[PDB]
Symmetry: C2
């Protein structure tokens, strides 16, 4: 006989585990996008939104870049993103990464003609 | 020779894929947690926070339940959760699910002594 509380834990609790925690998404993508050729890139963010929506950010709210230099813009809305963080140290070659999918407003630096994104400055919060 | 615009796309863009969309998390957990016996439970949500944090919700904001009846409470903070939803066409016994990780405030119905969660009412979108 399963208690009401017990059923809740079976059906809804999975503390400490998540689709991100066991995902090899960052391992595969950091390698696929050539960020593991010379050295294991320390940190990186992937944006899961249509390209035109990210490009449109260049014409949204103008904010100061993190280091104060350049022209940065913040997205009108939160976007789907994934943070990739090299884990356990070194070992370049083996580039091991912690995958963290989330939703955050992003800030990118834009430049050129057309005025497009050239640098991912940061995710907000 | 790679333009900065192209480098931004290579390093930060991944419009059609993500840790969640390529995750078998729900396919495995829905089965492992007994929600694919007899029929494929259509929708389910897993919470990845420590049990005590979810249990503590029973002492947070008292709200009217959204989908059921009883005594519901909404978490003061957002929590890491995962929505599992049957893909269209999935057919018993092999239940196929779309995995979707995110952060949302949750609403649970509580009862008993100790006063603990017995139902997952909804996530606040």
């Amino acid at each position: 006989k399963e208690s009401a509380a017990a059923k809740f834990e079976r059906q809804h609790m999975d503390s400490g585990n998540s689709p991100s925690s066991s995902s090899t998404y960052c391992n595969q993508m950091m390698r696929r996008r050539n960020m593991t050729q010379g050295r294991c890139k320390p940190v990186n963010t992937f944006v899961h939104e249509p390209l035109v929506d990210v490009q449109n950010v260049c014409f949204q709210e103008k904010v100061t870049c993190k280091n104060g230099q350049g022209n940065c813009y913040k997205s009108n809305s939160s976007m789907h993103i994934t943070d990739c963080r090299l884990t356990n140290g070194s070992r370049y070659p083996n580039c091991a990464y912690r995958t963290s999918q989330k939703e955050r407003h992003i800030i990118v630096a834009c430049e050129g003609s057309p005025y497009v994104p050239v640098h991912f400055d940061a995710s907000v919060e």
